[PDB]
Design a protein around this ligand. Structure first.
Ligand SMILES: CCCCCCCCCCCCCCCCCC(=O)OC[C@H](COP(=O)([O-])OCC(O)COP(=O)([O-])OC[C@@H](COC(=O)CCCCCCCCCCCCCCCCC)OC(=O)CCCCCCCCCCCCCCCCC)OC(=O)CCCCCCCCCCCCCCCCC
Ligand SMILES: CCCCCCCCCCCCCCCCCC(=O)OC[C@H](COP(=O)([O-])OCC[N+](C)(C)C)OC(=O)CCCCCCCCCCCCCCCCC
Ligand SMILES: CCCCCCCCCCCCCCCCCC(=O)OC[C@H](COP(=O)(O)OCCN)OC(=O)CCCCCCCCCCCCCCCCC
Ligand SMILES: CCCCCCCCCCCCCCCCCC(=O)OC[C@H](COP(=O)(O)OCCN)OC(=O)CCCCCCCCCCCCCCCCC
Ligand code: HEM
Ligand code: HEM
Lengths: 102, 52, 380, 60, 48, 111
């Protein structure tokens, strides 16, 4: 039942509500030390786009509004830009931890 | 030792600040009259002659 | 040259209330903690004007309370304002705690720990203050709470005798409870200063849970006038509660003098203790019930280690939102059960509510966060 | 002849000291007027029930 | 039991009128100071 | 070389040969003019029609007035007073409808 899981994933993505604020999935991650290091390694255009998206979301939440439905972040164009940087940061931190174990 | 404060510029500054200080003293006097219900003043104001 | 950024007394006020950077999108719930401070201040002021006529002797406690309500000019206003202000203080405190739970504000760990210490202090202050008017339910609730606190083996009896100052609740207990009820709110105020200091070290939290550094505004005049409006609204509910219905939240049986010979058919504390009392009735063990009470307060301090998600707030976690509202619903159920007689079907309902409470806070919420991470293609 | 908020700003609301003077005078007059009106309303609902309405049958 | 009953109800009536006066006015000042920000328009100019 | 109209004073000031007489750069081509992106563009419209006077046989000026050029219905076309009395009309009929529902529920319940 792959398409049932996929359509349920689309439903959960629409029901989470951050697509109505223009946000991506990687903007909603909590900025811990690994996530902050992932933002620090970003290229500057992606960093500026992310900062504008957070500012727009905070401005929309201030007025208790949402974007119009055509401006919502669609599921197919939601790019997981922070995944390789976060993956590298987790790999390096686990390597440091396993070196500190021995 | 306040002989620094004798001059025409300080006199002009004080002369400019007389009416604002007088108006603030009027505000303080009215506030002290109202918050204490002084019988020496409210018995002369025509409307407030009901509680005394 | 300006005294706002240079004068060392005004520098702290400037960096705490005037030019403090605050998120622009925090809703009305962020009023409540500030409301709590005002409530504390109001209580202290009214408490001071209650301390000017209260006599802390058993023969002249209820009589002094009636002298306050009957002969002192607007003493009824001061006393019923103090009682209803305590109730509104716990309303603000419960909503402050629930907002901290909903929006993931427990990641500020030191602020959360100073908070739960403040919660313990204000619960003790309220219990001793309710002992103070020396009514029937005051004396009997004091006797019940202390003699169930005696359930620790080999330490409990000596501890409850040293708390009592004797064999039971008597004049020494009333005097020491007046002294302790006087002394606790100043320690609460100092702990609130430490609470605000630990918050201002790291900044505050926005409802979206994101980083609010991209859009921050000065505290003045925005949250100044927002807090003024919240204070006016809190005063509207408080003055409605004191000036129209002074006894929906009180107990009639506290208007009788304290009788050690007569026990009431039903003994219960106030509503902000009642749910805990329900947990205290849930387990048919003395020491187990005492530990159930203590863990029922302390698992809020435990919850910073129960975060298994990579998203902070619950704004984008709908299953944990549903489970959180089930938890608040269970808290309302426990509050209702705590003021009920110990009789069927309230026993199995209270046991089910306590089991659901500890299961939701301990077990189900991290599992919900883990599966939400899995459905967002984050967890492996 | 402009609107009366222009008059209020031109004579009273511009300076802060005159602003404080007008709100103090308004506090005095509003105190007395609101107290008299609210009291009159209170005996309008409670007409025939208070002590001042039944006082004339006993007081000499 | 309540010698203060009539005075309490009179103070409650004055409180109801007084708060019905001052909730809209304080809300109006809040909406003034916060409608500074609630009509704020933000735009983005990336150099691409 | 001698004077350039500048310095925030609406006047000619002393400027260099490379700044007053060659204000363009020595770059080869212009690079780019990047666009501005926004949440949602607002609507722009003007209103200067106003109205006219009233009197006897003043039907054709109101005939001119009720030609729309506005995209507004005729029951909101007069402006202020019909709009507020419409506002009160729907408000009191909504209050009457909900008070009808409350009255019917209380009438259905016996005592
Ligand atoms: C409902 C009908 C009216 C309506 O739809 O109004 C639109 C408006 C929401 O429209 P919006 O523009 O989408 O929202 C942004 C607001 O305009 C921006 O305003 P806001 O939502 O930020 O309001 C701040 C908040 C501030 O709230 C507080 O300060 C309250 C703090 C807590 C006090 C204690 C509460 C709990 C007590 C328990 C016991 O105010 C309130 O919660 C209500 C204040 C009412 C003041 C008196 C008005 C007359 O709704 C209200 O304002 C509701 C309240 C008034 C009715
Ligand atoms: C709570 C209500 C007030 C909220 C703050 C506020 O707007 O204050 C008004 C103002 C600030 O609001 P403001 O920003 O409108 O400033 C007034 C601006 N002018 C002078 C140009 C009109 O605060 C004060 O004036 C200080 C308060 C005391 C005023 C004098 C009291 C005299 C009587 C005492 C007895
Ligand atoms: C009551 C109001 C309930 C309500 O309106 O809930 C919905 C609201 C949604 O807010 P949110 O999810 O942040 O999204 C806003 C738009 N994106 O969600 C909220 O407003 C969240 C409210 C959080 C605080 C609720 C506290 C309730 C009382 C809890 C008492 C017990 C606390 C624990 C004690 C142990
Ligand atoms: C510490 C804070 C305690 C609570 C502060 C609000 C107290 C309001 C109050 O009780 O005011 C009393 C007043 C009615 O006074 P009353 O006895 O009717 O006689 C008027 C002249 N003596 O009632 C009023 O003035 C109306 C209530 C005003 C509440 C404003 C709250 C801010
Ligand atoms: C240092 C400040 C305080 C003083 C001096 C003080 C003093 C008193 C006194 C003398 C009484 C008995 C009079 C009465 O019948 O109400 C009392 C009752 C009470 N106090 Fe306080 N109090 C203070 C702070 C607080 C705080 C912060 C709380 C909230 C936790 C609180 C909650 C209560 C409660 C619930 C009662 C019982 C009300 C009643 O039964 O009438 N008090 N307080
Ligand atoms: C004694 C009663 C309390 C007082 C006077 C108090 C006071 C405050 C104040 C003034 C603030 C800053 C304003 C705000 O953010 O709303 C605050 C924030 C906070 N308090 Fe409390 N508090 C109390 C109880 C608690 C308790 C019991 C907890 C723990 C559950 C707690 C946890 C927090 C947290 C986590 C924040 C910061 C969240 C944020 O700013 O977004 N407080 N408190």
């Amino acid at each position: 039942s792959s398409k049932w899981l996929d359509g349920f994933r689309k439903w959960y993505y629409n029901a989470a509500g951050f697509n109505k604020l223009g946000l991506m999935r990687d903007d909603t991650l909590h900025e811990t030390e690994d996530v902050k290091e992932a933002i620090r390694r970003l290229p500057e255009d992606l960093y500026n786009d992310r900062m504008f998206r957070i500012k727009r979301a905070l401005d929309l939440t201030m007025r208790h509004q949402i974007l119009p439905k055509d401006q919502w972040t669609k599921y197919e164009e939601d790019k997981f830009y922070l995944e390789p940087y976060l993956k590298e940061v987790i790999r390096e931190r686990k390597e440091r931890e396993e070196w500190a174990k021995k | 030792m306040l002989s620094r404060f004798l001059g025409p510029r300080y006199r002009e500054l004080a002369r400019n600040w007389i009416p604002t200080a007088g108006m603030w003293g009027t505000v303080g006097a009215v506030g002290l009259v109202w918050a204490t219900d002084w019988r020496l003043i409210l018995d002369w104001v025509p409307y407030i002659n009901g509680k005394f | 040259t300006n005294m706002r950024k240079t004068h060392p007394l005004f520098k702290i006020i400037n960096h705490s209330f005037i030019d403090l950077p605050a998120p622009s999108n925090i809703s009305s719930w962020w009023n409540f903690g500030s409301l709590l401070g005002v409530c504390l201040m109001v209580q202290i002021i009214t408490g001071l004007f209650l301390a000017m006529h209260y006599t802390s002797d058993t023969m002249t406690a209820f009589s002094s309370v009636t002298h306050i309500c009957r002969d002192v000019n607007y003493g009824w206003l001061i006393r019923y304002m103090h009682a209803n202000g305590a109730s509104m203080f716990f309303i603000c405190l419960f909503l402050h705690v629930g907002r901290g739970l909903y929006y993931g504000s427990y990641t500020f760990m030191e602020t959360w720990n100073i908070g739960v210490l403040l919660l313990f202090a204000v619960m003790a202050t309220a219990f001793m203050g309710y002992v103070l008017p020396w009514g029937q339910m005051s004396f009997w609730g004091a006797t019940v709470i202390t003699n169930l606190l005696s359930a620790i083996p080999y330490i409990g009896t000596t501890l409850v005798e040293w708390i009592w100052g004797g064999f039971s609740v008597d004049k020494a207990t009333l005097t020491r409870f007046f002294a302790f009820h006087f002394i606790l709110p100043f320690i609460i105020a100092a702990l609130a200063i430490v609470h605000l200091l630990f918050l201002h070290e790291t900044g505050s939290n926005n409802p979206t849970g994101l980083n609010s550094d991209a859009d921050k505004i000065p505290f003045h005049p925005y949250y100044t006038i927002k807090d003024i409006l919240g204070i006016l609204i809190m005063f509207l509910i408080l003055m409605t509660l004191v000036l129209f219905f002074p006894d929906m939240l009180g107990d009639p049986d506290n208007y009788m003098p304290a009788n050690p010979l007569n026990t009431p058919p039903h003994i219960k504390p106030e509503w902000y203790f009642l749910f805990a009392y329900a947990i205290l009735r849930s387990i048919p063990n003395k020491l187990g019930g005492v530990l159930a009470l203590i863990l029922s307060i302390l698992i809020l301090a435990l919850m910073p280690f129960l975060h298994t998600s990579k998203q902070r707030s619950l704004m984008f976690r709908p299953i944990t939102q549903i489970l959180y509202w089930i938890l608040v619903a269970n808290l309302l159920i426990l509050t209702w059960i705590g003021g009920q007689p110990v009789e069927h079907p309230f026993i199995i309902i209270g046991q089910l509510a306590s089991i659901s409470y500890f299961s939701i806070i301990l077990i189900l919420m991290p599992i919900s966060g883990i599966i939400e991470d899995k459905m967002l293609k984050l967890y492996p | 002849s402009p609107t009366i908020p222009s008059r209020l700003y031109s004579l009273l609301f511009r300076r802060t000291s005159t602003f404080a003077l007008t709100i103090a005078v308004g506090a005095l007059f509003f105190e007395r007027a609101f107290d008299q009106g609210a009291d009159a309303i209170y005996e309008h609902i409670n007409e025939g029930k208070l002590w001042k309405h039944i006082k004339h049958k006993y007081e000499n | 039991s309540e010698p203060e009953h009539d005075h309490r109800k009179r103070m409650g009536l004055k409180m109801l009128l007084m708060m019905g006066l001052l909730l809209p006015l304080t809300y109006a000042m809040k909406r003034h100071k916060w409608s500074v920000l609630k009509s704020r328009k933000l735009a983005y100019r990336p150099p691409k | 070389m001698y004077y350039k109209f500048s310095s925030f004073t609406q006047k000619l000031a002393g400027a260099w040969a490379s700044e007053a007489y060659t204000p363009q750069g020595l770059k080869p081509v212009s690079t780019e003019a990047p666009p501005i992106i926004f949440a949602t563009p607002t609507k722009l419209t003007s209103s200067v029609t106003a109205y006219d006077y009233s009197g006897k046989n003043k039907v054709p000026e109101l005939q001119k007035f009720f030609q729309k050029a506005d995209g507004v219905p005729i029951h909101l076309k007069r402006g202020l007073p019909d709009q507020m009395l419409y506002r009160t009309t729907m408000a009191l009929t909504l209050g009457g409808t909900i008070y009808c529902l409350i009255a019917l529920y209380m009438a259905s319940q016996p005592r």
